[PDB]
Amino acid sequence: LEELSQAQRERLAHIDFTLLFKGEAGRSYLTERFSVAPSVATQDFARYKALAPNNVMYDEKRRVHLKTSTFQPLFDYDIVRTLATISQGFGDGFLGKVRPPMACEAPFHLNKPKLEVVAAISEAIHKRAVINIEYTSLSSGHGSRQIVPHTLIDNGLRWHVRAFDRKHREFRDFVLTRISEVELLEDKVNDEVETLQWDKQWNRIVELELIPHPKLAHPEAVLIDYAMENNRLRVEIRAAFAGYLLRLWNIDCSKNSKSNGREFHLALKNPEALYGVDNAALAPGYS
Amino acid sequence: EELSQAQRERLAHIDFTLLFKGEAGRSYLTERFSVAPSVATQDFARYKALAPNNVMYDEKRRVHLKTSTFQPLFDYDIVRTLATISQGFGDGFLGKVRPPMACEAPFHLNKPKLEVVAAISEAIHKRAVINIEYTSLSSGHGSRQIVPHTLIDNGLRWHVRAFDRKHREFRDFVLTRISEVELLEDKVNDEVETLQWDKQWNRIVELELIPHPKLAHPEAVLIDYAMENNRLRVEIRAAFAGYLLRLWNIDCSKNSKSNGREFHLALKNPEALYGVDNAALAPGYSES
């Protein structure tokens, strides 16, 4: 299996995937996905049958290979990336719009940042550069400022950049869809103030204990849902994320689990862990 | 367009690297594509020919540089591209991948089991009935037959939209609470159990989102959500409305007067939620 070309492993994995997620796989799946010759696809299936003979049985009528009752995946899957592929499409995205390969929807996306804005911030992070941006903030409206970006973030809802803000001299999030212009500058980065190692809220990890909400009649449903152990799920997140994510995850973070207005499945067992976390007040019910 | 698919892919990876880093060298192509070192030069030459005003080789740095006049050679799927830079380069079928840059996506908790998602996807593809074990919030553990038709990545969990034969209704099942899946040979009643009869699924609700009225700077929300005429029109399946309005933190109360949650957006027309099952999950929504 490891003697093969990268291209050959990718096409084998696509056979594995198609058998696992559809009932079946034929030469047309490989020629559509990879634009290989039909004769190449035939060799692919032969390599697959040789590597996993008990995974596939051939159907002579329709000329498709069928998933058996004893199927075991030939490869390990990145589950996050695999779920992105079935809900988005098969490429890396660089060759135009793609579409999901199955009846799968992901309706939670609203608008995305502009390609050029994300690319420019990404470039500045890679080059360790200062950038001038225009930014329209909720707190003060439109303006300009210099920032020293260090990380791009897909948070639940929007994209933001974690950066040192030279306007107010603090590390801060900037929502990418509110960045209007990006200009790479030659100004020097102060590696004693402005770089990632000084970002305390970024570098502080908070250890959260999530438990089934006490009001639930069937907490065992939540134990299975979140793959909990010892009645809890331990999650470690950067303090700079805690507010965003606790609200996004709809976690009851009130002391007694009685401040609600919502329909919580999870409660934060140890709200003490949010002490000193900038923007913990975004977490539902946190006081 | 006259090139092989493998060659167009290598040209798109050059375009991406120049766009997202300042630069691109042969090592990026051999790492990503495992082509011979001599193949990468062929790629950059092909790229230089197709877009000469985008690149500028530096002999000392041994690297091709993005010019000030760069315009991407390809169109990008923005959702999938943002996924790739926050997840990694494969399709995911060859093992764990890692982001190609300083980019984090910290909102994922656990995912459904590979075999469970695959079994449901297979049943949807074959238009089959499945027996599942399911642990519900209302009744705990049990088993039932369901007729799945669509897989959903909602904001928070994955679910399958299906006809539930236990209570004879269309319904969501969270994939992480499905423990066993068994494909059946049982016949589907295409007059009761298929997608066309799923009313909440087929009903599209037309939401008008506006900057929240309590904001001092609504102009920040206007650029954020790319609004026009001070509103964003969003069309979603009724079966999604509750989930998504909560996930998006949209104020859906009649007279606002709701800012204990720091909303950036308000639902201008909560009348559009009447008769939507689980509208109650929408922040501040009150019908009766």
Residue numbers in the entry:
A (entry chain A): 7 to 293
B (entry chain B): 8 to 295
Quote from the publication.
Here, we functionally characterize a transcriptional regulator, BrxR, encoded within a recently described phage defence island from a multidrug resistant plasmid of the emerging pathogen Escherichia fergusonii. Using a combination of reporters and electrophoretic mobility shift assays, we discovered that BrxR acts as a repressor. BrxR comprises an N-terminal winged-HTH domain (residues 1–94), followed by a WYL-domain (so called due to a previous analysis of conserved amino acids), which has been implicated as a potential ligand-binding domain with a role in phage defence (residues 120–190), and a C-terminal dimerization domain (residues 200–295).
The asymmetric unit contained four BrxR dimers, supporting our previous SEC data that indicated BrxR is a dimer in solution. The wHTH domains are exchanged between the protomers, such that upon exiting the wHTH the protein fold crosses to the other side of the dimer, to the WYL-domain. Two sulphate molecules are bound within each WYL-domain. We propose that ligand-binding at the WYL-domain basic patch could induce conformational changes to BrxREfer that relieve transcriptional repression.
